[PDB]
Symmetry: D2
Subunit: 124 residues, 4 copies
Amino acid sequence: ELFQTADWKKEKHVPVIEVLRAEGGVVEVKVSVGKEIPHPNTTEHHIAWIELVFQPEGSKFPYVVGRAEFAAHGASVDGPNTSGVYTDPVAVFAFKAEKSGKLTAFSYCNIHGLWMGEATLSLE
Amino acid sequence: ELFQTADWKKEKHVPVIEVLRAEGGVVEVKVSVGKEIPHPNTTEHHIAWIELVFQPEGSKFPYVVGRAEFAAHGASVDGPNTSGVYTDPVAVFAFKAEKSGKLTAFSYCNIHGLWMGEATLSL
Amino acid sequence: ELFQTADWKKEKHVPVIEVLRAEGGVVEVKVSVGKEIPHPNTTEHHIAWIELVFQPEGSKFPYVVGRAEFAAHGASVDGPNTSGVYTDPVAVFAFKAEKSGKLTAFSYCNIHGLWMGEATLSL
Amino acid sequence: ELFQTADWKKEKHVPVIEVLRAEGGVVEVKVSVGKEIPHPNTTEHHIAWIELVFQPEGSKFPYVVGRAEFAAHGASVDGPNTSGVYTDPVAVFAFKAEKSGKLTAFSYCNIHGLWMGEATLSL
Ligand SMILES: [Fe+2]
Ligand SMILES: [Fe+2]
Ligand SMILES: [Fe+2]
Ligand SMILES: [Fe+2]
């Protein structure tokens, strides 16, 4: 597959999924690349986006919950890595859900290809 | 001007900018629509996205920090508004900054057009 | 896998990849959903986007070439399917490339999930 | 205003709107940066996206037709400007439209800020 997987404790590229809240219909999910091991963020090398998909139990098809783009990577008129502005590849997705299901995150490095990770959403 | 503006206390569409953290230039900015007055999230009427722009003092040009799309609005094979899955129009942008500057947020409702808001980042 | 696949001559959701031109490393790829069999485009039901991926021979990783979002689906203040504006899910990706390689397209329907298709790019 | 405007013949950054065709209720609209004067596409310096807005006669609000991201700028594990893949900042938007209106296009360079262009659609 194009979507690489790995242990996130060992591999900086794996998008890590964290369920911050899941109760009373409302959910809070944080996705982060480089959680254990930081990934570089330079004009030449950076994580560009994270996309979160959720498939409720009982639903034949998955739904994209959202997508986060990280657009600043130090680039300026003075040259690469000079602007002082760097977007950290961490996104928080807030959404309503009526029952439990599966989460999948997709992420992209401009040089190291595509990555995915999976997690259970246990709704209360 | 395409980008509408108003007082977020009385207008549901205004993207509200909140600086949650700014220590040592490590910054986290939350932007949301419907902070004071809620905006609908239905298959037929919803906020689709928020985009954050930061221009540091001394910088000739602004920079886009990030963009957040909210993609679920209840649609399913069984009809509109039946999936139970609705993405809130709230995003948190985390980024490094070494100078104070001007934050500009842009947002889009599928039927009520384009919106903007502003706030100063002070380090 | 999340990314469904099928024969585009019998399944409307399959993103279809056409190499319009590839002369002297100046490439134009059309990608579309609903080429043989039309897909609907209503407020309730539509193709949201297509993303094109290219991996040059000799390259260990693939590169996203582009993404197209199809944002209008008829919604207005007069209700769903009243604006008269509906973006067709057809994109054209124009790019330079030094070598032949593999093309992968991904697309998404707001109620029928995620989809994919593949084609070879020969220079 | 953040959105810069200029004469596209003199200014490489201006997104240029071109109505190609109108057939069977579908309109084709090409947007491109660097038509008259080319813009660079390096790992360091490049146009990242184009977004097209359409507001039909009589509509109180504008609608986003679509957005195109140009994701490849030469970066590889071998360094900047080594992969051979570079996405031209050129997009084609195909959509249905029953009425005339105003076309607005927005675009972004990673170091030269945000840009806008306007054209009329006549149907
Ligand atoms: Fe990487
Ligand atoms: Fe609205
Ligand atoms: Fe569908
Ligand atoms: Fe530029």
